[model samples]
Target chain A: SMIRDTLHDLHRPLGDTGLAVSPLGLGTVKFGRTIPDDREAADLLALARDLGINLIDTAPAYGRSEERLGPLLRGQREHWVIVSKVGEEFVDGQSVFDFSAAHTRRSVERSLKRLETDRIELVLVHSDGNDLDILENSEVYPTLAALKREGLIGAYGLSGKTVEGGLRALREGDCAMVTYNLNERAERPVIEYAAAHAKGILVKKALASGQDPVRASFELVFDQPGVAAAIVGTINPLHLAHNVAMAAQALK
Target chain B: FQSMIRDTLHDLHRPLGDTGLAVSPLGLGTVKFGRDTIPDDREAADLLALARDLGINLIDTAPAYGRSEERLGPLLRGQREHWVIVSKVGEEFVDGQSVFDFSAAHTRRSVERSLKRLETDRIELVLVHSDGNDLDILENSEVYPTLAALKREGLIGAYGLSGKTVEGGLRALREGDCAMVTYNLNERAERPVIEYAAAHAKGILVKKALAQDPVRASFELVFDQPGVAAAIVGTINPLHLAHNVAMAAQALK
Candidate 1:
């Protein structure tokens, strides 16, 4: 625990996005689902900040998550590297996905509105497994790039599926979120490509969506080449603490 | 991953009553997809892909569910045929408030809009979204006839009522191919309605199937009941979705 506590201070470059992130990012899927309390969510953010967890991954689909984080993250926005996505919305307890240029642009704008921030640090094209279609056909990446040019967002990338999709996205976009965990290694080629190209690579479901050997999961994902951070979601502070500790040990 | 999922969970399908539509006992509810908590499309797609791998073919969505239909349009493309989509009419979300409209004119517009939003020429199932005035809407409203006409035109494969009361459920069962009703251990007033549907070979879907303990009790207890074609459970968490599917599998065993 003591060694893990010290590891929190460590920060690494998140590819060429010109941003630095901790070994682990705090995923806020529970923001609107489990931890609905503004004060509690605020406390969790504060705790993450205190622990040197600078990257917070959220989306508009997390149910009032952006709205909840809006006021909670005010006055200290610079201390965090915020990552939000477009193309997905959560309404009435279900998920709907879109990746058209119009929706993409509007989603980012709305994200800005809900987040109470003029700019988001990183924006991703929340792909719908039709990664190839989204990459080859959709206007999402171009829209995000435009937003980046407009200074509304810093970097744009693909939280995608399939090796081909991620590789294409990395070629065209800035980063790629690959699901490289104990159970899933199909995206290894994408990670390797991102590593070769100096593009950002974030690991999602690093624990195989709760299939554990937590330390092993962290070890594999954190040590992967070109990896920026592992985004793990939890409402339990203890789990977050344990994850940070495990990440610290893994990165050791 | 696709082949792995198909190999493991392909046999988890059951007929959605006499409609001849086979659905996984667990249906993916899309109410949480596009409204209050906007999840990333990638994450939602991941969940959808995972659900498909788990043999979930039925998906529940509605117009009142903010942005749900709009979002599902692009996401469900190319794989729309694999899903049994359930969308509703008569509920409009305006300014974060719910407004109900069951008129014939509104019904036609709603289904057309839904068709455009879902990016499909035909919706598998269309339900009359009741605002709890079940009998009033069932008897007096144009929603039922509107859906029937749409079904006849091949715009929808089956039509039903997502009703709130026994009378409404029974009447809808009498007039349509299916009825979605609330039936759990705590509220079994709709049991008779389910029984009637079963007796008549009409399809019946259970909403709020979970009992007092959402996780532990509901799947089996409600599934154990007669005439339930499928239970529409809304959850973004992959773990819960897996657990619910596993529980349903166990209960069926």
Candidate 2:
């Protein structure tokens, strides 16, 4: 008898965006920042894909993460819900943010170029701890909203820092990427709000950035019905497999 | 001591850049207003009353400065237009920590909240409480334009950056109405920024003008700067504040 992969079974809609995501999303920070080897990072993504992970979160602030993913995901773009971001760039080990309309357009164009994809499934506003401000004040939101009009991107939202920012993102956009785990429950209101609004919610730091008890972290994240996916940025194949398996057990 | 320095600051008002706000050489910094200084409202009211009488109208406050804005909301009620309220937009203090956010969304929300908290529809000077990322905050963020938008809406009068870097200060001055820089006897790295503001007719507010205890010398050095509209003194003690105002008044001459 073969063991069933429950991760493959846990596909759900990302709110009204019309995109489907797995319960566990693969965050690729380590690919550009830590792994540095194509073969090793490729193996991790393969392992993640085999285990039912579909969403891949990458940002320009993640060292060479977005640039590296361009070729790494060539010919396999449609298989993943490629999540990228704008308004932040990693330069010389520090992150600088730009949320202007000009920067927003430039960011998406460069991200599309780097990801080797014509259309991104999602592009979030990377936070400078000013999530609500970005939504209301910056042209980044409306630019992405306009991008959704074209075939260039499928959806847009915010990777927010505040509860009000997260709620505002859901009200104005299709989704919100938020922090949730055992140690911090401050953003739970965002999750509950998203659930009530049919907006997609992606949980980052769900494993307390994997320092938390992994088994219980998976349980806590998956148990939240509002969560469309939990992004775990693992460079290790073993860790990637373990997270997916743990999530499978949690969902079951 | 109080009677001697009383109203001496009355005629020391100077133009704050091109904003037309007649600010004193000494402004009341309100970080302690939302903290222990307000253990009794009477003490704060007395301090504010004294500050007003001393011709210190530029009151620097921020949402990150404890509950300063909230405290000032009621304290300055019905006297909102009397002071050139200098509140900030980016840095917020929550749970005993300082967190920064410089997005247009947050800047607008923070400014609007400040308006409500300070019990004023229009704030005179709204600066970005930058968290050490001055260049990024100035070049990349929508904070400046958001502030300008508020200004156009009559919610704020002048907008600028409360920054740590000289480049940030220079750029903020070029783009906005004012720039708050840390200038003192010990730290003179921002001398170029002060010079730039002086040359360009931009407003310059010295953040650390009275942070140290040099008192008279500090006021003398800051007040002598060509474009310095004010030196913000965050003294909580009534006696210290009075003495600082006196020193500022003396330096103005």
Candidate 3:
């Protein structure tokens, strides 16, 4: 009952966004912190992009990630979509999600500064678990809606923790979401709910924190209702490419 | 080592990527089969099945004095497609007196029982167990000719001699179409012989790379050995086997 081509790489355009990316994307959580320096990170990022990857995802919360990648993507940001998260404040160098109007402006401004870009392709507000303050209130929404109107960001979305958070982010926050994925099917309902409302989905934890089989992780996520993309992270080229190959053929 | 593993009697360690099939280093020896107590048939079958699934394909066995084959043969049924299941056929205990019989008649009967008990039509590798002697068995007319005929009949894939001596191993390597020779670490008197045979032989298979000693780290020596692609060590625990093979593979890489 499953698709037969579960190992080939497939590039599907992201609806009307004019962006074509592989079913699997590279996660750079370790870029600014654990990776020690930028040369290796940039080389790997270049290799991934040259291999037809179009999405370069990052978060300001990650240690110096945007700072390192900002300069690396010089003259190349137009060729790729830079997705960053907002609704968070870096107080004393720690993540504190303050979904206030002022914080939204500051977060994106700092992200744009670190990434060395004036315009970001996508800006997602990080959900505070299942909180509904930003979704129900006009303070955060009107601010981001105005930013979208001003073209500071091409699109705006939400980043959620739970299924309720995802639903509120979609139906209430009125945006897309970065959702959780694993073997337990915990996020299936959220994905389905988001798909029903035509909300965008970017998947994290696709490999179940290195405990799940890579093949099953890709298959389950790609087969989900509205998963737009997933980040499968690895330091080994053989492992990374093998997973990309798996994602290419996993969806028919 | 974890506190639990360290508390145990054996000290073991393993590397990574040891479960693939291409060039496995450690071979599991269930040779001491039918000894101590006749193993439960169901348990033995389960072990072999799990072993194949884990890619530990080299199973070492012998037909010297026990009902090992009788218990192991049926368990290995329907699962011998890719394993190198080895059984030696020379040392025999008749009337409680242990001796070597490389005679053509004895070899034929031994192989027949091995075939029937194992429930397999062919043997992967058959070795002439020299026991404690050197070229004595190889020079003897009965041993070499009978194994050659068995090879001709497709009953066995290849043939070799199992002994601790280099002279006899080199003798077989020169005189016969032997694919693999079994050797150990610690006292590598046969190292030069292994190198020579490796240069001219089809493949060089090593055994006892751990020297059966607790102090010697078997994994390091086996993988570091020159001209050696694989090695066989004895252990009942699968985790132990995995450790040895993983270390061996890491060294090769």
Candidate 4:
């Protein structure tokens, strides 16, 4: 209720991929961790969608994000742009990584049933700190690229840690998720090149995750035309509303 | 990929959700029929012989249902194309007790093992056998998603939940294909789930409707809602099975 209506109208182009994403996309890392209530989770999703935020960033490694998101987005699948990841799964008490061809194919299909949709807008590789090796050696990139060909996903990319990885992912794929904030400008060249080449860059850790002042980080991240969307991993409703407001102010 | 399901054997068949598979109004349930209830192979064969004769094409069995899957593999060996077999994962009845495992490794292993035991390349449907934690199992575990992957690979024709809760049934239909719910004269809490399935054109298989002693009353109550694709009957006696199927036909008509 606290979010302004105009932010929903601020649909920014995601690179040159022809996908329009909200300036502030909802990140669901604390889904089953801190946001334990189902009603509150539903409320968070509702607020995001109603406030004009369309992109929802979820991953299998983020506990029960995909699981909860399936039921939460029931019947409203057409309204949102879902950005899910492959190659990582949360097992037992730790994050396990699997980049095999079989796992890549299985992971994409698993998310299909988990999210209860015939297709997803985007599927990124959930990098496990080994960004370059995954793109070059693993079958994940090719498998997802094939899944795109098969129409299971609209686009594919890598959520990587290196500039080289980011640059390569944007060249061969639709988008690249990179870390860019006041703390680190190391991936700035990747973003600059993405902007020039008509590719998408989704900024992660944009706020320094509270290390930098909130308003300052939103401004810094949005100042880059290369950045398609900034993922805000907040579960609190007030913070979500305030963040969306700040994002609106920055874009305006 | 799923358009490859076998044709419906019975004229009394109904569409099983949007999965493109048509099923008889009644499916022969094997929970107790093939387990402790029946005496010998010769007798179980008689029941199968009768079910096939009655134009009943659906057989709802599971790995945990004693030697149900193992026996059916041998009994239905020659004419596998005639029946739409619905199996399960997640819960196994081991050592005379129930065990639940929903991991990806366990789920994949279970389906492959069940396939090996059943001697079939494709199980027409596979539901997550919930341990009464319907929503938790579907949402948190890898079993449901793994079943979906298996479905894509043509390991199973479809995937869903054979669960016990109302909310779970709703969520299962929302994400998956169908739900096997407990609905009868005494328990109508799952009626909303059935209604939802009918409205959405999803599948709903009724279970435990035999709790009512009067056969006609039970069938009428369960079949009152047109959404119910079939009600699973666990009768071992030939005469009783005939009577139940007759009652189901009457109710459907």
Candidate 5:
């Protein structure tokens, strides 16, 4: 019963890293910014893992989101997952792209220390608009490749504007890409194309930053062909559960 | 479509009657025993006794199924001579989810558990039960080398994959000694796989033959399939078990 009960039959399953991700991914933008307490944010992380969520998405820019959320999840690092973003830095309360590989490496190192883990599941470049330059350059993308080679990161991806950016990231960066979707019908065309090519697309800003109804937005994104899944942010468990329920239902 | 020629037989747990092995053109499934409800001790013993009595020789189990081999261990303790006990590694149950613990350490642990549970020193067959979503898991992890090591240990007889997708199934066959599992009448998705396996002389066991909805658990669908070795089904009712054996027998040409 444990096997059947814990198992999910994905219609179009993605490859696993010996890990079973809940059909819904957990987002943590509000954890450090909105919660202000590291212990409380960690508790919420535990809640997500208990709910069968394996993909825990966070960013270095979410008001010290990783800084607070990481320490709390250190003990049970293998139970679920942690994905963080780089290419941007915070200084004097402003967001700026720290696209240097040294900065990226430092960001990941700090994340590992904070999360109390040696490896990260996935990392994104946090590109603003210039996807081609970063991916083509060795320092930015190769640093990720080297980290992947070192087993510090499981997989890498491109996160930012432009479907063209996503495409270039997939082709040049040779990794998965993150993009905006959810009834942004214009973004729909690239999803299936990406899935067909073996590149994964993680839809972000899927609700147009809360402009779209969450459920309907998820339905549209999952309905898209190559869209791996969408990432919705919040520190609230009740609201997070709602989004997760939407994902499970849409995929089913 | 895969080859439809399979070796099927009957159950002999019923009255004193015809209990000889008859190739009914089907394969027996054991995943239900491995993944579903854990059978109580007596039930497990009786099921094993009845399966052997019915002339069923080949049986399958996987690590993904919680307590499958453990539940059946005592029943199979001294009866390993009567039948072939096939088990799998690479699949593990964690927090109610089927996570791929295909690391060499995990695989060895899985085999150790199966060996301990089956009460046997060697497993007749060992397959990589990597589902469809395990490409990354398989590629990134040490499952392959671990499996090869198991074969080197004389613990595993034949190895393959219980794949979730057609493409992945083909990949398994192309890469290893592909043994396709449980695609029967209603869900004939493994047709291509069976054909390829048969062409390459790869072993094929069609499971889920009776579990399909459209056929109402008929044995003829499995028997009629071309490259099947045996088809596995499950039932708690003793009388129904007799009917299933008879059904498989009736399908013989």
Candidate 6:
């Protein structure tokens, strides 16, 4: 009954990516970031699944997030749709971006190894705010497409910054991560376009990076025209439970 | 003016072994930065600023400390000149478990990754993150040779071992710029290593330097010990950090 109430039978198609994910995806930046050790990470994932969160997001920039999640989600792979990123590596405590085709290919291969999966459910270009340049100049998209063709990845997109970058990514990418919250809506046009075109879209900073209230934020984002899921990187289990319940209520 | 002068001198720094770098006696351990149950960004930033104001310049991080290095990257930008970043290799967090690799390849790759993560062209200091297999890592492992090569390439300034045993610390000090040993009042097993480092003019940094149960005697004892340059302590509380710095200063005086 609690799970039924919490999940609220909520699921949304992630654009035209042929995948249905929960309205609130579990952001695993906290998996290795603030969740302390692995046991806590396992606990969080289990709780997330119990609440019907079928989508998980991580990145190489999140330190050990991907690595920690690899073995934890082994047998229950299809139970959750996983999103990871490339082009950004957290080295020596700094964020470094490499979008070269060679690096993209190498990054995907390494991410595959780190995630302990033959194929990642979805992969996004972790943007450095230079979305357009990364899209036009770097071999990220083409390489991701090739990987998709090779069956190494299910879908690919851009975690972009500017509206133009997001739009351009939607034209060629399967999805695009946009910052659409109460404080910022500069990428609304991109989201509108994706919604209309049936292209995948994920929302980042949905809670304004923990600056906004969850209930209102969830209501606002979930009520939007086209948002596949909102990823919130909170390591607090209570926050996760509260946010999931709020999203369930919002969807209703 | 007197207080200002004392405060200026209060942020005392000493040479890091034979390296050209001079580090503050108080080094911040960022083990909790990206870890769970820590303060928010603003609060974390406040702690960093407080550490800076109090004259802390060395920051200790590792890939094993989940996002600790990544979080410090952007937070530490522009203030790079003021901080001596210390990162490590050999220990990696995968599948939520700590795996040790002291091979030459992992060492080189880890250093390169650390340089990028810290946003520094050349890391000020790099340490071999021992997995408690100090001697085997030192003798049989390729970590030191790889670090030595990286140093020659100007990618890292100084290198050492964050080791367990006194023998490992002494061996590391014999060839490296420093050795991070565990020395507190509760444990004096590494005392000989520190003395040897002092005699040889090698750098000696203490990890878990504070006794688990704080006593004035423990603080005074560790600080009073020969060759102890600085201690790495992880505390998110500004008051606790300030108190520790004050205690270290008083002990040295």
Best by TM-score: 3
Ranked by TM-score, top first = 3, 1, 6, 4, 2, 5
RMSD of each: 22.8, 25.5, 15.0, 26.2, 22.4, 24.0
Model 6 over residues A180-201: C-alpha lDDT tens digits? 8878888888888988899998
Off by over 4 Å in 4: A209-212, B1-253
Q: Residues B62-82, candidate 2, lDDT per residue (tens digit)?
A: 888788888899999877778
Candidate 6 DockQ category? Answer: incorrect
User: Total clashes, candidate 2?
Assistant: 5
Clashing pairs in 2: A132-B105, A133-B104, A133-B105, A133-B106, A134-B105
Q: Give the per-residue lDDT of model 5 (tens digit) for A1-252.
A: 011122134423333333345555667777755353665565556555655567778888777677766666657777765678888776687768867888889988987887778888888888767776776663777788788899998877777566666676676443444555543555554565677776666777776643116657777777766665566776654445446555666676
Residue B190 of model 3 has an lDDT of 72
Question: Which candidate tops lDDT?
Answer: 4
Backbone clash count, each prediction separately: 27, 5, 10, 1, 31, 11
The CAPRI quality class of candidate 2 comes to: incorrect
The C-alpha lDDT values of all candidates are: 0.82, 0.82, 0.64, 0.84, 0.62, 0.82
lDDT of 4 at A84: 93
Model 3, residue pairs in steric clash: A5-A249, A6-A249, A6-A250, A7-A249, A7-A250, A8-A248, A8-A249, A9-A248, A9-A249, A10-A248
Q: Which lDDT tens digits does candidate 6 get at residues B66-165?
A: 8888788788888888888888998998876889889999998888888788788988889999988898898998999899999999999899999999
Q: Model 5 over residues B1-253: C-alpha lDDT tens digits?
A: 0101122254322110011223323234455565655556666666656655556666667766666777667667667766666678876778768776777888888888788888888876677877565455556777767876777788875566666666666666665664556575467776787777667655565656654213334556654555555665656543344446555665653
Interface RMSD of each: 15.8, 31.1, 16.4, 26.8, 21.5, 20.7
In the range A2-104, model 3's lDDT, one tens digit per residue, is 1122222456544334556566667766775446356566666665665567777778776677888888888888877777787665568676877788878
Interface RMSD of 2: 31.1
Kindly report which residue stretches of model 5 are placed more than 4 angstroms away from their true locations once superposed: A1-20, A36-39, A172-177, A209-212, B1-253
Separate DockQ for every predicted complex: 0.01, 0.00, 0.01, 0.00, 0.01, 0.01
Model 3 residue B120 distance off true place after TM-score fit, in angstroms: 34
- Where is model 6 chain B poorest over a 10-residue stretch in terms of lDDT? B1-10
